[PDB]
Amino acid sequence: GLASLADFPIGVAVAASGGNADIFTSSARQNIVRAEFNQITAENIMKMSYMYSGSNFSFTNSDRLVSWAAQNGQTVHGHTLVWHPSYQLPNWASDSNANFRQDFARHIDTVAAHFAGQVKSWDVVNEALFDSADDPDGRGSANGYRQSVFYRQFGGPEYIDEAFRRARAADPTAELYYNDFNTEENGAKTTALVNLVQRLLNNGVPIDGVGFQMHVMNDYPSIANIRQAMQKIVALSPTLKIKITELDVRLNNPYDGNSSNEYTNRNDCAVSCAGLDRQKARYKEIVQAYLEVVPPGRRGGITVWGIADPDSWLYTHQNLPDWPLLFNDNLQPKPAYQGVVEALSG
Ligand SMILES: [Ca+2]
């Protein structure tokens, strides 16, 4: 399968919360993972609050998944040690908590140490950059940084430095990544990413690489912009790695100012459409851009954000259907899959 075609990780996000996509119950999905991939990311169950049961740490469910990976040919990318969304914040992660900075330290120290030797790499900090699409409380930018509870408590971006040093100290063997979305657009957020990373480098922070989530549409952003955005980060350092962490590709673009070019019906791309053919070319050009701009040393992996289309967080978006992944609803490989094969093989 796909992983045989590369000498860097080829990974997939897996579900473990019941429902049809849950990897523990779906032998069809288990079989695809073992045949095609050599790394998994937990789609959900390694987020912050999942490390607790009440006020105590609990690693039961995540240990099960990490063990499954070790038994079935997969390394693990840990997603994620620090991340703002309140749905996954531990209860300690609150402006009402006098013990914040200590509880933050305990979090990173405990979790990173717990998984030492079992988890290859981590998203140490995820989504530290401001994004208007992504500001439900209307906090606004602090010179490009998200004013998350971590930022507010530390009084600035120093939490990022601390998270990285603590992770490094707790598990010196893991590759440590900073992860974010929309940074492939090569606009304002990419600039903010440059600022963020440069500051970490200036401070001597043990960041090993940068993750681009790569939640793209078929025709936006342009591949030239994707390529240049990566180039800008590669140029910051002679050793900084680049990983594509959450790749998926939406046929439909509701943000292009043209509402006449959508596939509005689930049946539209059930079998064949211009969209699935473009999606093949889109996966292929992105895996090509990555290879062309990221030197081999420095390639930390490519991961797609789920196995089969109905598992995707983008299966429906903006009340429209989409088909974002490499396998279809019947778990058959799509043209997308072939696009990856062609890219990997040259
Ligand atoms: Ca459109």
UniProtKB/Swiss-Prot annotation:
Pathway: Glycan degradation; xylan degradation
Organism, scientific name: Cellvibrio japonicus (strain Ueda107) (Pseudomonas fluorescens subsp. cellulosa)
Domain of life: Bacteria
Catalytic reactions of this protein: Endohydrolysis of (1->4)-beta-D-xylosidic linkages in xylans
Keyword terms, alphabetized: Carbohydrate metabolism, Disulfide bond, Glycosidase, Hydrolase, Polysaccharide degradation, Signal, Xylan degradation
Protein's name according to its UniProt entry: Endo-1,4-beta-xylanase A
Domain GH10: 17-343
Top EC category: hydrolase
Active site: 127, 246
Gene Ontology MF term list: cellulose binding; endo-1,4-beta-xylanase activity
E.C. number: 3.2.1.8
First and last residues shown, out of full length: 265 to 610 of 611
Keyword Disulfide bond assigned: yes
